[PDB]
Structure 1
Amino acid sequence: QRSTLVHWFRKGLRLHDNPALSHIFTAANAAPGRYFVRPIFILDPGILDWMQVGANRWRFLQQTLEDLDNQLRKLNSRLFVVRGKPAEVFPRIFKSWRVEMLTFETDIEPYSVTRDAAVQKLAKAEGVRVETHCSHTIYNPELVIAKNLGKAPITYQKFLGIVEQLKVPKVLGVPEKLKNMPTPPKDEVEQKDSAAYDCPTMKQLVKRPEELGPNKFPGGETEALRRMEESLKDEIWVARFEKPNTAPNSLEPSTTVLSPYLKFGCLSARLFNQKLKEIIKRQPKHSQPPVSLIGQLMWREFYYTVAAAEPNFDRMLGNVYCMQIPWQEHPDHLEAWTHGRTGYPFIDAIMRQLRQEGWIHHLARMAVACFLTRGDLWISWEEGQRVFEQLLLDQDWALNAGNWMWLSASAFFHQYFRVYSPVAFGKKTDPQGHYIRKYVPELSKYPAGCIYEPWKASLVDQRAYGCVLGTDYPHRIVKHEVVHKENIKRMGAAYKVNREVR
């Protein structure tokens, strides 16, 4: 008959560099036999078949929760995957566990800001001590906005200048092994079913396993650390990394692919930063921001900071940053883009890899995002934002919204006369179309001369390649060489309108 200390997992699904978790552990061990520890994850079982989460991401979470539990097991504890909505769940477990303290990592997102505040109100209402920590991002956005006179920086170089005069907190290790800790006595839910708070098995989280592609990126802290060290092994590659030089269409990833791990917080962005810094010092010839690997981490920090200031960051309407652009509805052309049936092989190959594997290269993301928006289809960046939210393992509210606005030249980036060619952009790095042959296998017999542009080959040729256009592979839905120039003007028109308000 003791009191309960709760750490609440949401993001930051790791033991390493988790001050919010460490504080629970170091309190408990420094006050032996007076406490029970409940590291919890609150799962809403109602939202398992809501469109905007693909099966691939459900697998990632399932694997992450299973790892987190295995890692907590080693510290003489375990994970508690409590089912229900937080609003219902907390009051019950507050009374039945006799909770003295609650901790969690902060989340700048709106849906969470209001939910956390609602919990934090209830916390005070029940006399439950609450101590939050900022460990998702390297820099706390609210300090960045403050230090820049109550306004989030809208450019990168300004942002770099603001943050490099702020202290970077200590990076922590793994919490203490819990000394003298019996399993917390079974609450009212556990009495009726002992396995009530166990990790959801695949069957439980993944309700639509036919959407599941190859498991190229396993979830969890362990794989996050494994993949990081793997990348940091070639300290030369790390040092001279330049984002634009990385191929969008290489068969194996040209970049680190730590974004899903950074998204869920299986990898501490602080630790990745710290690990990179010491490599920089060891490698005399090394790249500088924005193109550097550390620069990429800073871009994450940049998009986060601006997103904290605007709760309408995911929308055009009501957005302090977003240029107002008269986007047009096209349910047909949206359907084609979403499933990789545009008729542009390069665009299709990327979209198909996204749906199948849940990750695509940044420049590949950039290529398809252009095509949908100002590039060709003139469809809103909010539309592709849904597709990405559904299909990305690294789905990040702030990063997704920020880069879509960057792309469509709604915010941050403005040189709209730079338009990605769905035909040319891919050829540079993949002259043979190995990427297209893999993901759009219909056209795998096509020569490198017209595999990027099948509409250039005759009917006899089409037959000889075993792929007749209109049957085995769609006719291109629009003509890029025509539409992009009309869209360039459409941009300028909207750009003028906007100054006429400012």
Structure 2
Amino acid sequence: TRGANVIWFRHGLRLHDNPALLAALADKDQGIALIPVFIFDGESAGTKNVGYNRMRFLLDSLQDIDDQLQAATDGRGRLLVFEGEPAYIFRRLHEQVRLHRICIEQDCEPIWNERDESIRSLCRELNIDFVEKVSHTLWDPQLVIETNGGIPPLTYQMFLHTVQIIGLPPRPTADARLEDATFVELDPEFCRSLKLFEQLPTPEHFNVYGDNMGFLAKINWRGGETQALLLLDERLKVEQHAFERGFYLPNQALPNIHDSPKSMSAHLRFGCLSVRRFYWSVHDLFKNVQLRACVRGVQMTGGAHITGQLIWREYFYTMSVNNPNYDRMEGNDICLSIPWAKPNENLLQSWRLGQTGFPLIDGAMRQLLAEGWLHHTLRNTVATFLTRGGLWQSWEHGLQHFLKYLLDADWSVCAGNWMWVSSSAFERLLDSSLVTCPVALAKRLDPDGTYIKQYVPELMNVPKEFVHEPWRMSAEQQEQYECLIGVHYPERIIDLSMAVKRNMLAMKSLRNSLIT
């Protein structure tokens, strides 16, 4: 037996900046081979409740890894795709070929704690070393907790100081030299007995059927490493336009809706693009745009404002590793028990299917069902319409629906964002400030009404003056323009002005009753 090493892609679906693969590619001179394995256990990579868009994104990314391996190894090496219990597969793989160590990427979320402990107990009882490198995050979340003093940092400014004394996150590592790696061919009988996928399957194989709604996806989303790097060239150009202008974060400085997206959320979550590579490629772009434009009038200042959203994604990761109930309220010591209304399936299905009667909320919710990605402002206005400024429902319903249909469904990030918009856990707690009104925000994100007309196909003849507020359109204009409210486009399911004023009355009462 020559021996073989096992790299498992629970996440971090890439080859560049993979410390797990660097440990996998080590011990070459002894004769230890390499086995790349993906396991479809129904839980890994967010497959418990997965829509057609995210399942295609995972399936397209697996083809890109297989195409990368078949190009560097000229067909000698290929990805192995399985479907079964991970403890059963690794035990049978250890019997055929003697393993040496299983190297993974560290998934810090506690929903993978039961899976990791089962694997950790398996290798310890089989005299197999366990390797768990961390590359999904800039800093180790358990390291931040230990340096803070046994309690996670409960403030963004307190978390920013905690990572200041930790140091800068590490630079991206080298690229794996898979051109000389040893791959082992298995017995074909062992492949059918272990449910090995001889070809890459379809999303219909996992009972995830493509809906008829996805015809109106104006843009197309493609996963994998190759699409992650080509889009990275496009977003850094967007950054360079803002860097020569004097401001940062162009996605939240100039909010553009009716164009191609410039977000590294889907590729970064699945690991098609390394976060550390994304962190440093936009900081080194900021470093040499400060130096060579210092002769010009505009001079930069430096700091962490360039990647201010990446610290936010680590803030939710830090206060979720030790909280197994991070996605709910019962047993959760971070969020209050806000008395939401009784869960109404009629209002929820109207909100989920994009039939609420508000053109921005209808346009945004139909975009998620068709493409799987929204803008951050578009995600905030549909999370405020359901929890605070509107239906007054529980955020757990919106969190579960977001986790099923998002292209970037991160368990710690989405639950943290849903508990911020509802304002139940973090700072600016129980705020009685102005809520995100969809009527006013639609009139200036897309004043022309192009984006609303794109995703709502019932408003072709509706002009730009009436498309944001079709309820102001008269009955005579409704007949001649094919915008009959109630039979073509739904009426507003709730009164927005009455519901907003009612909720802040209950919001102020909770704040007053919080004291004593």
Normalised-by-shorter TM-score class: over 0.9
Instruction: Note the 1:39-118 alignment, pairs <5 A.
Output: 39-44=36-41, 52-76=49-73, 77-118=77-118
Letter of the aligned partner of 1:383 in structure 2? H
Letter of the aligned partner of 1:217 in structure 2? W
CA contact (8 A) 1:96 1:187 kept: no
Q: Which of 255, 270, 292 lines up with 1:247 in the alignment?
A: 255
CA contact (8 A) 1:59 1:206 kept: no
CA contact (8 A) 2:266 2:407 kept: yes
Please tell me whether residue 258 in structure 1 is matched to residue 253 in structure 2: no
Please tell me whether residue 482 in structure 1 is matched to residue 493 in structure 2: no
Equivalent residue number for residue 277 of structure 1: 283
Please tell me whether residue 458 in structure 1 is matched to residue 471 in structure 2: no
Between 420-429 and 192-201, report the one with greater CA deviation: 192-201
CA distance in 2, matches of 1:48, 1:265: 10
CA distance in 2, matches of 1:464, 1:338: 30
CA distance in 2, matches of 1:19, 1:421: 45
Q: What is the TM-score when the length of structure 2 is the normalising length?
A: 0.90
CA contact (8 A) 1:289 1:295 kept: no
CA distance in 2, matches of 1:429, 1:191: 54
For the aligned residue pairs, the C-alpha RMSD in angstroms reads 2.5
Between 335-344 and 317-326, report the one with greater CA deviation: 317-326
Please tell me whether residue 436 in structure 1 is matched to residue 449 in structure 2: no
Determine helix, strand or coil for the equivalent of 1:103. Answer: strand
Equivalent residue number for residue 343 of structure 1: 357
Give 1:50 shift.
7.9
Determine helix, strand or coil for the equivalent of 1:309. Answer: coil
Letter of the aligned partner of 1:348 in structure 2? D
Gaps of 5+ in 2: 291-298
Give 1:90 shift.
2.4
Between 233-242 and 8-17, report the one with greater CA deviation: 233-242
Change (3 A) 1:377 1:6: same
Equivalent residue number for residue 448 of structure 1: 464
Letter of the aligned partner of 1:433 in structure 2? G
Percent of residue pairs bearing the same amino acid type:
37
Determine helix, strand or coil for the equivalent of 2:26. Answer: helix
CA distance in 1, matches of 2:144, 2:20: 21
Determine helix, strand or coil for the equivalent of 1:233. Answer: helix
Please tell me whether residue 227 in structure 1 is matched to residue 240 in structure 2: no
> Aligned pair count?
494
Letter of the aligned partner of 2:12 in structure 1? G
Between 381-390 and 187-196, report the one with greater CA deviation: 187-196
Give 1:45 shift.
6.2
Determine helix, strand or coil for the equivalent of 2:433. Answer: coil
> Can you list the C-alpha shifts for 1:75-127, whole angstroms capped at 9, x where unaligned?
42221111102133222222223211100011122221121011101110001
Between 279-288 and 147-156, report the one with greater CA deviation: 279-288
Give 1:477 shift.
0.5
CA distance in 1, matches of 2:221, 2:35: 29
Instruction: Note the 1:59-208 alignment, pairs <5 A.
Output: 59-76=56-73, 77-167=77-167, 168-179=169-180, 181=182, 183-186=184-187, 188-190=189-191, 196-201=197-202, 203-205=204-206, 207-208=208-209
CA contact (8 A) 2:352 2:401 kept: yes
Give 1:170 shift.
3.4
Equivalent residue number for residue 222 of structure 2: 218
CA distance in 2, matches of 1:173, 1:125: 33
Change (3 A) 1:92 1:429: same
Letter of the aligned partner of 1:199 in structure 2? L
> Can you list the C-alpha shifts for 1:15-34, whole angstroms capped at 9, x where unaligned?
00000111111322x43xx2
CA distance in 2, matches of 1:276, 1:423: 35
Change (3 A) 1:426 1:180: closer
Q: Which of 391, 404, 424 lines up with 1:390 in the alignment?
A: 404
CA contact (8 A) 1:100 1:129 kept: yes
Equivalent residue number for residue 37 of structure 1: 34
CA contact (8 A) 1:436 1:444 kept: no
Give 1:201 shift.
3.9
CA contact (8 A) 1:6 1:24 kept: yes
Change (3 A) 1:49 1:115: closer
Change (3 A) 1:180 1:17: closer
CA distance in 1, matches of 2:337, 2:422: 11
Q: Which of 290, 294, 312 lines up with 2:307 in the alignment?
A: 294
CA distance in 1, matches of 2:153, 2:211: 43
Change (3 A) 1:490 1:175: same
Change (3 A) 1:293 1:473: farther
Change (3 A) 1:484 1:234: closer
CA distance in 1, matches of 2:424, 2:459: 35
Determine helix, strand or coil for the equivalent of 2:363. Answer: helix
Give 1:487 shift.
0.5
Letter of the aligned partner of 2:337 in structure 1? Q
Give 1:205 shift.
5.0
Q: Which of 312, 316, 322 lines up with 1:309 in the alignment?
A: 322
CA distance in 2, matches of 1:386, 1:194: 30
Determine helix, strand or coil for the equivalent of 1:262. Answer: helix
CA distance in 2, matches of 1:288, 1:409: 31
Equivalent residue number for residue 424 of structure 1: 440
CA distance in 2, matches of 1:26, 1:125: 23
CA distance in 1, matches of 2:147, 2:188: 46
Give 1:390 shift.
1.2
Question: 4+ residue stretches of structure 1 with deviation over 6 A?
Answer: 45-51, 191-195, 287-290
Determine helix, strand or coil for the equivalent of 2:131. Answer: strand
Change (3 A) 1:264 1:286: farther
Letter of the aligned partner of 2:386 in structure 1? L
Q: What is the TM-score when the length of structure 1 is the normalising length?
A: 0.92
Give 1:40 shift.
0.7
Determine helix, strand or coil for the equivalent of 1:44. Answer: coil
Determine helix, strand or coil for the equivalent of 1:101. Answer: strand
CA distance in 1, matches of 2:282, 2:502: 44
Between 368-377 and 69-78, report the one with greater CA deviation: 69-78
Gaps of 5+ in 1: none
